[PDB]
Curated annotation (Swiss-Prot), chain C:
InterPro entries: CRISPR-assoc_prot_Csy1. This is CRISPR-associated protein Csy1. Disruption phenotype: Mutants lose phage DMS3 infection-dependent inhibition of biofilm formation while there is normal biofilm formation in the absence of phage infection. Decreased production of crRNA in the presence or absence of phage. Disruption of the entire Y.pestis-subtype CRISPR region disrupts crRNA production but does not alter phage resistance (possibly OLNs PA14_33350 to PA14_33310, and the flanking CRISPR loci), indicating this CRISPR is not involved in phage resistance. Interacts directly with Csy2; part of the Csy ribonucleoprotein complex with a probable stoichiometry of Csy1(1),Csy2(1),Csy3(6),Cas6/Csy4(1)-crRNA(1). A Csy3(6),Cas6/Csy4(1)-crRNA(1) subcomplex is also formed. Residues 64-85 are annotated as: Disordered. CRISPR (clustered regularly interspaced short palindromic repeat) is an adaptive immune system that provides protection against mobile genetic elements (viruses, transposable elements and conjugative plasmids). CRISPR clusters contain sequences complementary to antecedent mobile elements and target invading nucleic acids. CRISPR clusters are transcribed and processed into CRISPR RNA (crRNA). Cas3 and Cascade participate in CRISPR interference, the third stage of CRISPR immunity (Potential). Involved in crRNA production or stability. Belongs to the CRISPR-associated Csy1 family. The gene is csy1. Pfam families: Cas_Csy1. One of its GO terms (biological process) is defense response to virus. It comes from Pseudomonas aeruginosa (strain UCBPP-PA14). In this bacteria, Y.pestis-subtype CRISPRs do not confer resistance to phage DMS3 or MP22, but instead are required for DMS3 infection-dependent inhibition of biofilm formation and possibly motility. Keywords: Antiviral defense.
């Protein structure tokens, strides 16, 4: 469906995520879609039986997104949530054929 | 009838560390005394040559960006200036008892599994796989970057039952094709050695030694070690190398990767050639995984068909299922 | 307390209703406050069975293994040489495992202990505002049917394949397969120790006095060889609660043998070195001899512990030379006398290469060996030189006791030294 | 805890890629529960065929090489990881952390069975080492020998019979072949000693080990607090926190015919010693022992003093 | 249709660390066993000469600090007092196969890259680049400061097919220019040796030896290392040099920096000599970055225009795009 570009690179850490959105993201990507895909990836992992991707709302996208704000990482709220809904909407078209 | 909720397998074909030492070619016969390639530190000043953002690459701050060049202390391993042959050796052992799991919930699943594995061996032994594992010991697949550009590569596979060597093999790894699996008189003598090891119990120890004409004072490539969190940007030792007892060496899981690069049965593309045997078969260099569950060629999708509901796959795909049982793995619910 | 409940919700007003969006404030300015009087306390009534409080978590073993996170406490073991999380008792920081978008429910139910006790009494103190809490009156009976349920665990005995299940053999019986968990509170109690014991108020106080050398009586700790183990990797708050000082790390204590990072490339002997003869002049031996010199042998005011600690200290050196002997013996087959021999007599006789053969032309001594004791006497002559200076010990029988300390350890030392040549 | 008849010696076991985390708190040399479970796996495979009882185990540890590195500016030392195969989508893999350490240990054993009277001494030592070559000790492989063929053969001392002179000269032959190492025992009594010493305050048992993993630079009443040995924290065993289940009522077990309890780890004290310090080498053995009525599942060196 | 998120090219033209050793001139075969130039220390005290920050421009402030000394220990490498000639020896290994990346995500981007690179090769070989790398072996460009102020420089280039030597080259490195690229038959005979190695047709291993008359007891210049900034009193050490086995050496990438100084294709002013082939082709000494991305001439803009959307750059500029594939890099970050 949808793939990132700053991810699937060399192996990252939390400190290397924060320094990206402190810049304008990175080369070939953007600071919205880094914190947005991170907020979607942190939300989609916490599920119990992973048959409840439809249960992922906008609220738990925010709760993982605020973890970066606790340690630097000045982000954009309206941009990253909209990117996190793109990967969530992409993660249901594959569920229905 | 159902899947066992816990399945686990130990690995067979258990390699060791690949120590390195350098010397002179035609002095290979007395290469029990060659001094080891050591890991040397050096400083290196570079400039920034990555891609830039569109917010960047204005000519003002680009010139100011190269006013503060990055500095880093990297590790390098080199031959001595008089040697020309790298010697890489390791002691592979072949354990056996291949289809036996190490952990399983359901005994009704376990006896259904052991009848399925014994159905394979009685139809065709491990000699198809052991012909293929013999090539990765024949060609120097375990020399990942050390093989590229060499004058001649020679592999000396001995055999060990005591201090006495049972049978010694000699090869030329460059003439043996890196992409093809073609049988030979010496290969089939070594293939049936492995297939006798994998079938029965008790380990069948080997000793693989590889030589490669590289050059005088040139660079070798030990396995780069994974520092997770490097510290301050003053010391900042980027590119640490793997060394055991002050000898530059290759990780066992890198040698153990190269022994099992025999997936020649892709659904999409065999143009890349034989790459590693993986469940949901993935390549780290290519950056994406073949054998998807949108295809019917997973390990898990082929296993439960061939065990529970008796849907036997293609005979070529049956070789893929056994090969994941050789490498081990911890399986699901 | 109702106002103290609602001032918390007034913070929850002000914490959430703070950045009014000009497009979607029609629910956010209006509806977001209306539930916050009573219905928000009913909003969390359906939001209890989505979170749990655990003393022990499973997810540090593998971050996707669905298991049974538990909360129980161990008993006393019985043999007091042991140590676990049963030593804590009252200081229990039970890190809640669950969804990040609902943990305010646990911050809401933190209001039991805040000020008043009210922990086990989620069954009383219902209707009124001041001495009770005014979790409101008719709904003070079906809320407690829910809000107590976060304290109990979800009842399902379960594990996962990725959960480190271990057999353990029994006396004359079968096996209990033990599934160890990860003690979160026992770890977090040590972070409360180690962050205090390294750098704090009083810890920095005694460190600043090192330059001052002004000793008020207060010791300060020092923890070498700590190891950092991280959990979660790029995603630490998706597992059990990792706080702002425990930010996805565990300080690990070193458990290492003394032959760690030793001299792997073993430097040979028989050179112009004036020390390296019979005792191994290394930084692991030089730090040991100064202990015997500076106190416990020179400063003597007792016969109970002073005479005792001199006995095992030379029993260390009697065996440290044996440690020095075998490392020099092993991995050096090509030892000989020809490089740099001026005063190294019988060192070819004691710390020889055995070679499975003898090497001799104008000599017979190399074929065998009997009484290699003169280098042991020279070691014993070094043990008299090992103590630096003590002039008041000669008239006392302490040096006569030390001569017996010299004598009773050579007697063990000569007999050990026989079978390398006898 | 039965007194051993013989003492089987595994001479120099080189260990590739062993585990080094060993507890939630005590990084380093792997747990002594790994060694006691190893001998029970030999008793599983060999000792029922040679009709012998393999119970005790000694730990010598001739060489310990961990795969650690300290970063730039820090003083704590972090671990070296390894890559993993990619995800289903092939993006990346999650990071788990596993300590990793090369190791070279030697293992004394204890033998009780009648197979000593039936099989000769070399037949005992040959069947064990040929089995123990193709096994794993601490989650890592066991490596063979090359290029000098010296430390290959085993040893065995029938220390049940003979006069006390005949033991003691023969006992000095094992301490030759165990000399570059450092023997490991448990000191459960020193931790009981210093808790009763520290009663000016009201401390805990876990607060004592932090004062034994020490560099307590004491201010003058400057100075460094002395150590009577190489005291070190070890995992002592396990302590159950759950009632004892039926074999078929816990989901995702290993097998469905043995009972289960969820346990903790349990921390104790250990001291590393030279082998010539200890008088009797039969005191050096580690015995797992447990009372299943309550929740204890521990191991120790008994009879040591 | 898009660039990959991982692009990595294994480098070609891989040299070894240049070892330095010293002796007398007019020694041809006696130059095999020189004593090596060793690194030694000396005390250095020299007073204040920096630009003051206009706060420190008081007479009482200089005279208080002009008296306070700055005792420093440096590392120096000198010739012996009976030696006037520096021998500098390394080995270069031309690998070949420049178009193939070592790792790439998009195989469609990979196959588009391998056709675009092969479009360059069959139209015109590496012999334009190989003529330019052959001059930087001919003149002693890899002697950075050691070349400056010499009597005469003699460069001897051997080609070791086996342990024996296939063909020897001899050059007067000062008669061959340093800016322009001349034409000679012996330079051509080493050019299509490299062109036969860059194309992967054969195997190229070279032994490069450079002699330079400097003078009796003069100073040579190994590659300087990096010191750690420490707050140590009573002075410190201020310059560390490079030596592998107590013999003063030049880094491998300092040589490799000098081999690829073939870029005479600037936007700004080509009449200023060649510089190193770099993305955003920049000079550390000059302090500015030639070939700005505000012009459409850097490596990243010329690549994807010629790979993704398929307009060719100038043939004058196509050699620069290929020469970044020979040095390799970490592209697509």
């Amino acid at each position: 469906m949808k793939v990132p570009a700053f991810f699937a690179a060399n192996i990252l850490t939390i400190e290397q995520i924060i320094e990206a959105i402190n810049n304008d993201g990175s080369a070939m990507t953007s600071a919205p879609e880094i914190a947005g895909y991170y907020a979607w990836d942190a939300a989609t992992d916490a599920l119990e039986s992973e048959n409840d991707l439809e249960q992922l709302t906008e609220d738990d996208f925010v709760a993982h997104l605020e973890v970066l704000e606790e340690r630097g990482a000045k982000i954009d709220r309206d941009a990253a949530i909209a990117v996190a809904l793109q990967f969530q909407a992409a993660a249901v078209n594959d569920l229905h054929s | 009838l159902s899947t066992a909720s816990v399945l686990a397998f130990e690995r067979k074909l258990d390699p060791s560390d690949a120590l390195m030492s350098a010397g002179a070619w035609a002095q290979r016969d007395a290469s029990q005394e060659w001094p080891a390639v050591t890991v040397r530190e050096k400083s290196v000043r570079g400039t920034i040559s990555n891609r830039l953002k569109t917010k960047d690459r204005d000519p003002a701050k680009l010139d100011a960006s190269i006013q503060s060049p990055n500095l880093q202390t990297v590790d390098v391993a080199n031959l001595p200036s008089d040697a020309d042959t790298l010697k890489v050796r390791f002691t592979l052992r072949v354990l056996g008892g291949a289809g036996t799991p190490s952990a399983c919930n359901d005994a009704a699943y376990r006896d259904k599994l052991l009848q399925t594995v014994a159905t394979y061996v009685n139809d065709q032994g491990f000699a198809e796989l052991a012909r293929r594992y013999a090539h990765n010991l024949a060609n120097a697949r375990f020399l990942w970057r050390n093989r590229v550009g060499a004058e001649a590569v020679e592999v000396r596979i001995n055999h060990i039952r005591q201090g006495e060597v049972a049978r010694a093999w000699r090869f030329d790894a460059l003439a043996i094709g890196l992409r093809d699996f073609k049988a030979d008189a010496e290969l089939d003598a070594l293939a049936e050695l492995i297939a006798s090891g994998l079938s029965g119990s008790g380990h069948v120890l080997l000793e693989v030694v590889a030589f490669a004409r590289i050059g005088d004072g040139q660079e070798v490539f030990p396995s780069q070690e994974l520092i997770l969190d490097k510290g301050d940007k003053k010391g900042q030792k980027s590119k640490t190398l793997y060394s055991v007892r002050d000898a530059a060496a290759i990780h066992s899981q890198k040698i153990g990767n190269a022994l099992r690069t025999i997936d020649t049965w892709y659904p999409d593309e065999d143009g890349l050639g034989p790459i590693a045997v993986e469940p949901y078969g993935s390549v780290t260099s290519q950056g994406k995984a073949y054998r998807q569950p949108k295809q019917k060629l997973d390990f898990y999708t082929l296993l439960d068909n061939w065990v529970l509901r008796d849907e036997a796959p293609a005979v070529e795909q049956q070789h893929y299922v056994i090969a994941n049982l050789i490498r081990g793995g911890v399986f699901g619910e | 307390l109702r106002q103290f409940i609602e001032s918390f919700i007034q913070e929850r007003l002000q914490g959430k209703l703070d950045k009014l969006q000009p497009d979607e404030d029609d629910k956010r300015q209006t509806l977001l406050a209306t539930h916050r009087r009573e219905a928000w306390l009913a909003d969390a009534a359906r939001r209890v069975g989505q979170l749990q409080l655990v003393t022990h978590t499973l997810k540090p073993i593998h971050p996707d293994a669905r298991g049974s996170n538990l909360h129980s406490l161990p008993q006393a073991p019985g043999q007091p040489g042991l140590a676990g999380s049963h030593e804590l008792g009252d200081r229990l920081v039970s890190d809640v495992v669950g969804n990040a978008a609902a943990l305010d429910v646990f911050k809401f139910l933190s209001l039991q202990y805040q000020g008043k006790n009210l922990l086990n009494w989620l069954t009383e103190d219902s209707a009124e505002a001041l001495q009770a809490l005014s979790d409101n009156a008719e709904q003070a009976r079906e809320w407690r049917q829910a809000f107590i349920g976060i304290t109990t665990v979800k009842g399902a005995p379960a594990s996962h394949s990725l959960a480190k299940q271990l057999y353990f053999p029994l006396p004359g019986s079968g096996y209990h397969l033990l599934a160890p968990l990860f003690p979160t509170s026992l770890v977090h109690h040590v972070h409360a120790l180690l962050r205090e014991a390294r750098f704090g108020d009083a810890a920095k106080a005694a460190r600043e006095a090192r330059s001052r050398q002004e000793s008020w009586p207060h010791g300060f700790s020092e923890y070498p060889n700590l190891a950092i183990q991280k959990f979660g990797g790029t995603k630490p708050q998706n597992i059990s609660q990792l706080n702002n000082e425990r930010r996805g790390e565990n300080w690990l204590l070193p458990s290492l043998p003394p032959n760690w990072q030793r001299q792997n490339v073993n430097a040979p002997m028989r050179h112009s070195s004036v020390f390296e003869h019979d005792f191994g002049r290394t930084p692991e031996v030089s730090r040991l001899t100064r202990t015997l010199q500076r106190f416990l042998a020179k400063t003597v005011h007792n016969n109970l512990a002073i005479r005792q600690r001199r006995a095992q200290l030379v029993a260390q050196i009697c065996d440290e030379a044996l440690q020095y002997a075998a490392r020099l013996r092993e991995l050096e087959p090509g030892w000989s006398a020809t490089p740099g021999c001026q005063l190294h007599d019988a060192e070819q006789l004691w710390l020889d290469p055995l070679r499975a053969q003898t090497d001799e032309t104008f000599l017979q001594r190399r074929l065998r060996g009997d009484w290699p004791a003169e280098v042991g006497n020279r070691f014993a002559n070094w043990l008299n030189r090992a103590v630096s200076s003590d002039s008041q010990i000669l008239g006392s029988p302490e040096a006569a006791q030390w001569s017996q300390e010299l004598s009773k350890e050579l007697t063990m030392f000569k007999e050990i030294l026989e079978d390398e040549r006898d | 805890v039965t007194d051993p008849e013989a003492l089987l010696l595994l001479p120099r076991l080189s260990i590739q890629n062993a585990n080094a985390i060993s507890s939630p708190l005590t990084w380093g040399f792997p747990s002594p529960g790994a060694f006691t479970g190893f001998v029970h796996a030999l008793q599983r495979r060999v000792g029922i065929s040679l009709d012998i009882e393999l119970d005790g185990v000694g730990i010598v540890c001739h060489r310990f090489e961990a795969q650690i590195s300290q970063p730039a500016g820090k003083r704590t030392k972090v671990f070296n990881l390894t890559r993993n195969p990619l995800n289903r989508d092939g993006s990346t893999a999650a990071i788990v952390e596993e300590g990793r350490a090369h190791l070279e240990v030697s293992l004394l054993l204890g033998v009780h069975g009648d197979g000593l009277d039936d099989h000769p001494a070399q037949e005992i030592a040959r069947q064990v080492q040929e089995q123990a070559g193709a096994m794993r000790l601490a989650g890592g492989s066991i490596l063979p020998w090359c290029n000098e063929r010296f430390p290959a053969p085993n040893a065995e001392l029938l220390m049940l019979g003979g006069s006390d002179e005949q033991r003691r000269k023969n006992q000095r032959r094992l301490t030759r072949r165990l000399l570059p190492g450092f023997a490991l025992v448990s000191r459960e009594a020193l931790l009981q000693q210093h808790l009763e010493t520290l009663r000016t305050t009201l401390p805990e048992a876990t607060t004592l080990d932090a004062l034994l993993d020490l560099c307590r630079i004491n201010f003058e009443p400057w100075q460094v607090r002395d150590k009577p040995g190489w005291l070190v924290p070890i995992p002592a065993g396990y302590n159950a926190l759950s009632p004892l289940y039926l074999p078929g009522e816990v989901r995702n077990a290993r097998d469905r015919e043995t009972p289960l309890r969820f346990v903790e780890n349990l921390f104790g004290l250990g001291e590393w010693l030279s082998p010539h310090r200890v008088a009797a080498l039969s005191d050096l053995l580690w015995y797992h022992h447990a009372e299943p009525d309550k929740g204890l599942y521990r191991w120790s060196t008994p009879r040591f003093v």
